[PDB]
Structure formats: structure tokens, C-alpha cells
Design a protein around this ligand. Structure first.
Ligand code: ATP
Ligand code: MG
Lengths: 393, 62, 208
């Protein structure tokens, strides 16, 4: 049937479980009002349901939101629309200062007398609110070993001018805000993206290349407007594009009835990228697998300045990636990986992780604690032969 | 309407260099009239105004 | 301070229940400002000072509300009486802190006898932070890297000590309650390797 793997095996298990259930039985015994179609449990809003909700009732009115057009001379005399209700010539309440009520502003106004009460944050739609990462994955630069030249080149661009805006002033130069990455897939571009975003110290913004193609005309551009708006607002923010081939790869016109809309959108990215009052403090990181079928306008420097590529490790990048994907796992003290990488003349870091994790699967299926060194030998053997007579290869 | 590096009359094909002087197409370049202006300093000053001193989130408030 | 008690307490604090000797819930007002020095709780303390201007009379609370308002933001650092050091051990923090909370029962022990303790009751706070070099000359600024408290007990051999690897500092910074920062580059932290805010930095190039 079974055996006692560790001494009091169930003796901790059911002892934990029955008191866990007793935590519930305490709650239903005491009486809990659950499933009241979207409310809070009474234990914490009973002592909040008092007149310290009327303090939210009377002191704060409905505060209908509206949008500002312009002002007048010597006085506010503000012209405002609500959204679709009507346009009025209204004035601010005495609770505000006649400074931060500049035009094109979403402002809260009284429902009764139509007087401005509050300045608001401008509008930003969810479709782009969701592409802002708002988080930094833990991707350390050491995890991207095997591209010392590339990570250095990128370091000179996205990192050094920002964290040290001193040398470039002491010599009088401008950093190349435009970086493109390319090379064969499964190589260390994404990793570089996540790692740079780790120490980004900036409003880093993901962009998925296909997210822009849409059903209506110009709306994708309307995205781009909000993009460069949130960019210019968030000082020292980064932008990442990925597989931009969908955007503007060519200008197919022999039979000019093919792709045009994302061509126009690509033009909007052109203008709002460079031309007519440059952006200021922004950095652009791109990456594609086929940087060969793109419109040369993006290929113009100033926009896409550096062309960093990630190659296939000759013999030693695969060794170090054995040290990267083989390090974060349990093995015996009898390691050696040069023997391994000498066995895989052509394999990527991704395949390296595939062999490292495939190493564990033997002990995993063979009821073992860890991937023993010799088990890792068996792993590289089955992946040496597997990759030797691989399906596609 | 005339240049200053060669007194050659021009008219509407003259130039207005930073140093306030007009030049012909041959002398429009700062290296053809010895322009006495610190382009490097207006350098170290424009880049300093356009360059946002980034701040690693640390020692903010109280 | 965390949102759980930070919100649950004012659920019994904004509602003072003044039918009691209300300066008990007002006493709890004071030491509910007991959290990691500065915080976004100025909304809470400030609002409860506005509703506490007229209500929760200033005859007995006018010192109290701003008293708790200002306690977090005194030198903007320096709260350590938690009976915790290094990561979890003990250390006084009780002889000096405790007599306040015992001295806070309800009433006119804030009037005559109280003013001796209530002001300087607890003063066993040992600074705040650890960003320091102390290489014998004391000139170093070694690259640190602030993060979250080390949550790890045993998972594997290549196991990440912290998660919030984003921030990176080098000099005097912010210790915070859940922080177990290590650093990188192996500029050589051989002195203690168990933290403690005055490391000596024996310098050495151990294959960097
Ligand atoms: N040198 C390396 N070190 C560590 N891991 C690597 C290395 N090269 C590749 N990998 C692994 O292989 C995967 C592929 O890398 P990456 O995602 O950067 O390639 P990509 O160019 O973005 O892929 P695609 O071209 O298909 O979009 C990564 O998830 C990474 O973990
Ligand atoms: Mg990729």
C-alpha cells in the first residue's frame, strides 16, 4: 500500500488538516454572512458603517466630471463641456487656485451650480494601461552570459547615459537613443530585455507588435499618441517593441491594394518618433528575427541607431550556458561541462536549458531526490542522440 | 548685401552666421571665417538641460 | 506597519467609541502611528486630525493627534526597539518601550505623573540603516542593492536570497523592516557576511 516516508507521515498531515477544517467550523459555528452579491464581511464594516460614511456623504458631493476647452482674460471665465450634456461658461469654486486649471483638462464640477471643484488626472485608456508592465521581473545580468560584446554595447546606450549623465556632458555628446536587436531565435534578446527592465529605474513600457493592428482606421495611431503622451509625461521612461515586422516592413505598391493601414500607423510612429520638436528623454529598444524586410525609414539612424545581434555560441557560450541552466538545479559534486559542450556543436541556450531540465526528468521518473551527475550524463546522452536524430533535424 | 570674408556682394543668397555676420556660400562655414563662439559650452549646456538626471529609488522622504 | 492591521485598527479607531474613556482609543491613536517611520498613513492621521479637530476634543487629545502624527516623521528614520536584530534575535527594547504602553491606561496619568515617562519613555532606538563601508580609511561606497527581506529557508542550492532586486544603492540608505540586502560584484564582504550596518570591508580580488 504505502510506507512511512518521514516518521510521523500522516501524524502531522491529518493533525494539520482537521484543525484547518476546524478553522472553517469555527467560522460557520459563529455565523458568517457570505455571498451577499458583492459586499464586505460584516466584521470590518460594522465599525465603519457609522456617520464616518456621511463624512463621505455630505462633505463630498457627486462632482460630475467634465472637460475644459479654454479660459478668458482677467478672470477664469472657463468654457467647458460635460461629456455630451451641454457646454457652459462656468467658473471655479473658491476651493481651488487659478493656476492648475490649464486647458484640455478633466475637472470635477458641481452638479447644481456648475462650478469647478477639482483638477483631475487626464484620460488614459486600458488598452495601453495594460501594456505598461508596472513590475520588474528578476532577471540579473549574469543570467545573460555569453554575449559580452552585446551586453556591453547595450550598456553603453540604455544604462550609462542615464545613470551617468556626466561623461557625455564633460565631452559634449548625445547618446544613441535607438537600439535594435536581432539574430537567430532562442538566443538572449528577451533575457536582455527583462534584465535591462530589472535595473530599468524607469517607466518601462512593453509593446507587443501585433497589438496595434485593429479593425478601424487610425485607432491604432490613436494608441501611438497616448503612448508618446505617457512617455513624455513619465520622465526617463523606456519603450520596447518586439517583432515590428507587422508594422511597416515594406511599401508594397505594385498592385497598391494590399496593406496600407499599418503603413499609415508606421508613419505615425515615424513622426512621433522623430521630426518636428524631438521627444526629449526617451529610449527605444527593438528586436526582430528577420531585420531584412523593413522600410529603410526605420533603418535611418537617429531612430534605429545601433544594430546589436546575438550569435550562436561556438563551443564556449554553450559551456557557460551549461553553467547558467545547469547551476540552478540539484546535482552531485562531480560536475564537468566542457565534455558536454564539446558534444553539442550547434545548440542554443534554450536547448541548453532543455537538456538541463531533461536531466532532472530521469530521477523524477526514477524516484530520486536529485539529478545525480551521472544522471546528467544520461540526460546529455539522450539529448545528444535526440538532437542528433531530431525530428526537424 | 555683402560678405565679410571676401567683400563679394551677394544680396539674397547671403548667410546669417551666429556671430551676427553675413557670408557667401564659400565662407558660410565657421572654419572659413574663424567663428569666435564656444559651440562646446552651448554644448555642455543644452545636453545638461535635455538630459534628465535619473534617480535610483532611494532616500526619498523622511 | 502593513495594510492588514493598518486598516483594521482604524476600523476601531476612526470610530472612537467615546462612551468609554475615549482617550483609550485615542491612546491607540498614538501608538498606531508606531509603524515603519514614514508612510502613506498621513492620509489616515491627517484625516483623523480633521475629524478630530472639533470631535475628539483638543482639551485632552490636541497633544495626542499631532503627537502620533509627528512620531513617524521625527528624524525621518531611527526606529529600532523591536526586540529584533540581525534577522530575528532579541535586545532590550522592552525596559524603555514597555513602560509607556503600561503608562497609557486611560486618563490623568497623562496629566501629572505621566509627563515624565510619556515624553522620553522609550529611547532605546538604535539608528536605522546599514549602508556603510568602514574600510579602515572609511572612504568606500561599495555597490549595494536594496531588496525585500530574505524569505528563504530551504528550497535548493541555487536559491535566490531576495526578490526585489530592482533597487540598487551604494551608500547610506534605508534599512527598512523586511530587508536582507547582500550586494554583488564581490568587492569582498568578508567581515561578517551576516549584516549589521557597520561592516569593515576587508578588500580583496577573489576572482572578480
Ligand atoms: N546565452 C544564453 N544564456 C542563457 N539562456 C539562453 C541563452 N541563449 C538562449 N537562452 C534561452 O533560450 C530562450 C531564447 O532566448 P530569447 O527569448 O532571447 O530569443 P528570442 O530571439 O527572443 O526568441 P525569438 O527569436 O523566437 O523571438 C530564452 O528563454 C533563454 O532562456
Ligand atoms: Mg523573443
Amino acid at each position: 500500500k504505502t510506507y512511512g516516508q518521514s516518521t510521523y507521515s500522516r501524524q502531522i498531515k491529518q493533525v494539520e488538516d482537521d484543525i484547518q477544517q476546524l478553522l472553517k467550523k469555527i467560522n460557520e459555528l459563529t455565523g458568517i454572512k457570505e455571498s451577499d452579491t458583492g459586499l464586505a464581511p460584516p466584521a470590518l464594516w460594522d465599525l465603519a458603517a457609522d456617520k464616518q460614511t456621511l463624512q463621505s456623504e455630505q462633505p463630498l458631493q457627486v462632482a460630475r466630471c467634465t472637460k475644459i476647452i479654454n479660459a478668458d482674460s482677467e478672470d477664469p471665465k472657463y468654457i467647458i463641456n460635460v461629456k455630451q450634456f451641454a457646454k457652459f461658461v462656468v467658473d471655479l469654486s473658491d476651493q481651488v487656485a487659478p493656476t492648475d486649471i490649464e486647458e484640455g483638462m478633466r475637472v470635477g464640477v458641481d452638479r447644481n451650480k456648475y462650478q469647478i471643484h477639482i483638477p483631475l488626472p487626464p484620460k488614459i485608456d486600458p488598452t495601453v494601461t495594460m501594456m505598461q508592465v508596472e513590475e520588474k521581473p528578476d532577471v540579473t545580468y549574469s543570467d545573460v552570459g555569453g554575449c559580452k560584446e552585446q551586453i556591453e554595447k547595450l550598456r553603453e546606450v540604455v544604462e550609462t547615459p542615464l545613470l551617468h549623465p556626466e561623461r557625455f556632458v564633460n565631452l559634449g555628446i548625445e547618446p544613441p537613443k535607438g537600439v535594435l536587436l536581432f539574430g537567430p531565435p532562442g538566443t538572449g534578446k528577451t533575457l536582455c530585455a527583462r534584465a535591462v527592465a530589472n535595473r530599468t529605474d524607469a517607466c518601462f513600457i512593453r509593446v507587443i507588435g501585433s497589438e496595434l493592428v485593429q479593425k478601424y482606421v487610425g485607432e491604432g495611431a490613436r494608441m501611438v499618441r497616448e503612448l508618446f503622451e505617457m512617455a513624455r509625461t513619465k520622465k526617463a521612461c523606456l519603450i520596447f517593441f518586439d517583432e515590428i515586422d507587422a508594422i511597416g516592413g515594406a511599401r508594397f505598391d505594385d498592385g497598391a491594394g494590399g496593406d496600407n493601414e499599418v503603413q499609415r500607423t508606421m508613419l505615425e510612429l515615424i513622426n512621433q518618433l522623430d521630426g518636428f520638436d524631438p521627444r526629449g528623454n526617451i529610449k527605444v529598444l527593438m528586436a526582430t528575427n528577420r531585420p531584412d524586410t523593413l522600410d529603410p525609414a526605420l533603418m535611418r539612424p537617429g531612430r534605429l541607431d545601433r544594430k546589436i545581434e546575438f550569435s550562436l555560441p561556438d563551443l564556449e557560450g554553450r559551456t557557460h550556458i551549461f553553467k547558467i541552466h545547469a547551476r540552478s538545479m540539484s546535482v552531485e559534486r562531480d560536475i564537468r561541462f566542457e565534455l558536454l559542450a564539446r558534444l553539442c556543436p550547434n545548440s542554443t541556450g534554450a536547448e541548453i536549458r532543455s537538456v538541463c531540465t531533461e536531466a532532472g526528468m530521469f530521477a523524477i521518473r526514477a524516484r530520486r531526490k536529485i539529478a545525480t551527475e551521472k544522471d546528467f550524463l544520461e540526460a546529455v546522452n539522450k539529448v545528444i542522440k535526440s538532437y542528433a536524430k531530431f525530428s526537424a533535424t | 548685401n555683402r560678405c565679410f570674408m571676401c567683400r563679394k556682394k551677394v544680396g539674397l543668397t547671403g548667410f546669417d552666421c551666429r556671430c551676427g555676420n553675413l557670408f557667401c556660400g564659400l565662407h558660410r562655414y565657421s572654419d572659413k571665417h574663424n567663428c569666435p563662439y564656444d559651440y562646446k559650452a552651448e554644448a555642455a549646456a543644452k545636453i545638461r538641460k535635455e538630459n534628465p538626471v535619473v534617480v535610483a529609488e532611494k532616500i526619498q522622504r523622511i | 506597519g502593513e495594510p492588514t492591521l493598518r486598516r483594521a485598527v482604524p476600523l476601531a479607531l476612526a470610530l472612537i467609541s467615546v462612551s468609554n474613556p475615549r482617550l483609550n482609543i485615542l491612546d491607540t491613536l498614538s501608538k498606531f502611528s508606531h509603524d515603519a517611520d514614514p508612510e502613506v498613513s498621513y492620509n489616515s492621521i491627517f484625516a483623523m486630525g480633521m475629524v478630530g479637530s472639533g470631535t475628539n476634543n483638543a482639551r485632552l487629545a490636541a497633544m495626542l493627534r499631532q503627537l502620533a502624527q509627528y512620531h513617524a516623521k521625527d528624524p525621518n528614520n531611527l526606529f529600532m526597539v523591536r526586540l529584533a536584530q540581525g534577522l530575528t534575535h532579541l535586545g532590550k527594547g522592552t525596559l524603555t518601550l514597555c513602560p509607556y504602553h503600561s503608562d497609557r491606561q486611560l486618563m490623568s496619568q497623562v496629566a501629572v505623573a505621566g509627563l515624565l515617562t510619556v515624553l522620553v519613555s522609550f529611547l532605546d532606538v538604535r539608528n536605522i540603516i546599514l549602508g556603510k563601508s568602514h574600510y579602515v580609511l572609511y572612504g568606500l561606497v561599495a555597490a549595494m542593492q536594496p531588496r525585500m527581506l530574505v524569505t528563504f529557508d530551504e528550497e535548493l542550492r541555487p536559491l535566490p536570497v531576495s526578490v526585489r532586486v530592482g533597487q540598487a544603492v551604494d551608500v547610506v540608505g534605508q534599512a527598512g523592516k523586511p530587508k536582507t540586502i547582500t550586494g554583488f560584484q564581490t568587492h569582498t564582504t568578508p567581515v561578517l557576511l551576516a549584516h549589521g550596518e557597520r561592516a569593515e570591508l576587508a578588500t580583496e580580488e577573489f576572482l572578480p
